[PDB]
Structures are given as structure tokens and as C-alpha cells.
């Protein structure tokens, strides 16, 4: 398992771009792709994970553990207390993947400590914990990310709302940005300020798997069925071809079977 180190406290749009390029290159399968868009690996391709070390201001750091197969954040770790590694596993991680989050994030069995994320990673759950009806009400931003890291990293007790806002911002600026070029570009455009994620960024996030299946299944560039999406203004956006949505996608979710690779 390799880790991508991103200095949140001191960056530029160029360093943000390099970060995402490195994360996509490490997460993606070495050869799997459809219509020239790289795809994530099959669940049993090793390594199954990739770590993202987010270095914030005031020596506050948090490491995210992501599953390569779908880029979902499985949990995170933060340097805690003396010289301990505090790992936090999502409520929706089960079986062997649970000891995996523990041993991958904190390899030293002698100094690791647990602090569960007492709720699952679904957006509606995160939005509920953050006390909002929509994550559109929670602004994203480099400085906002930095601030949320500092509210969690090394801090013994923190509220679920605090944790949820950190998770909402980090997932979207890391996982969602890696998957979608559009989302990366939204962050780059508002790099020095806070911004509310638009209807297109949220839709893309919610239709990623659908988009990925449609592209994998697309015959001669034509999507199996018209795919209804929504643009930046919130208008219904019906896509019929791969060429119409491909500019927004950086990585495709894993979809079994052969496809038009170029």
C-alpha cells in the first residue's frame, strides 16, 4: 500500500493537480480502461488500498484509507497523544476489511488506538450528522479542509457534527475530485476561497457508478440508454454519448467484462 502525501497547509493549484494525478495513478488498474478512461481495479487486485496523508497547518495531519476498487474512504488515522496512531473505521466496514483498516493505517500494533466513526459513509448519513439537509450547504475549500483537519487531528473528543464536516469536505476534495475532472476543476477555480458545491458536482458524485456502467457498456460510443444528469445550473442534462460526459470523468468505477477500451 502506497500513500500519497498532500500538504494542505501550503499549496498551489499546480500542487493540488499533481496530488490528484498521483492518487489516480496509484488507485487505477494498470491496464483496465474504457473509451480511454482508466478504470479502478477488480476487488482482488493487490494492493487493495491506497493511503492519502493530508498534512495541515500547525502540525495537524490525518491519513485517509481508500479502497482502490471504488475509491471509497474506509476510515482515517491521526497522530494521537504521545506517539500513538489513532485509527477510525467507518461503521460500514465489516469482516476482514476492519482489521485491514487497523493494520494498514497503524502498522505498529504496539502503539495504535481505536476511535470508531459511529456512522456509515453514505452522504445522507454525513449530511444528517453535519446537521444539514444537503451537503450543498457545507462549503468546500483548501482552507476549510485545513481547518477541519485541525479540529480532529490529535483531539481526544470531538462531536459527530465536527467529524461529519471533516469527512464531507475530505471525501469530496479527495475521492470525488480524483474520480471527476469537473470536480477537480471546481476546486482549482475557487482555490483561494470557500465555495458551495454546485448541482453538477453533487449529481456527478451520485451518478458515478451509473456513468461508469454506461460507459463500460456503451456500444460504439453510444450509451445503452439515455442517461439523465444535471448541469451546474441544476437543469436536466440528458447525455447520449460517451463523448458528452467523458470530459468530466477522470476514473471509472470497476465494471466487469470487456469494453471498447479506446
From Swiss-Prot:
Report a single Gene Ontology molecular function: rRNA N-glycosylase activity
Active-site residue list: 72, 123, 176, 179
Determine if Cell inner membrane is one of this entry's keywords.
no
**Residue sites binding substrate per the record:** 73, 121, 175, 179
Tissue expression per record: Expressed in spring leaves (at protein level). Expressed in roots (at protein level).
The keyword Transmembrane belongs to this UniProt entry's keyword annotation = no
Task: Write out the similarity annotation.
Answer: Belongs to the ribosome-inactivating protein family. Type 1 RIP subfamily.
Oligomeric and partner information = Monomer.
Q: What is this protein called?
A: Antiviral protein I
**Organism from which the protein derives:** Phytolacca americana
Q: Which gene encodes it?
A: PAP1
Full-protein residues shown here are: 23 to 284 of 313
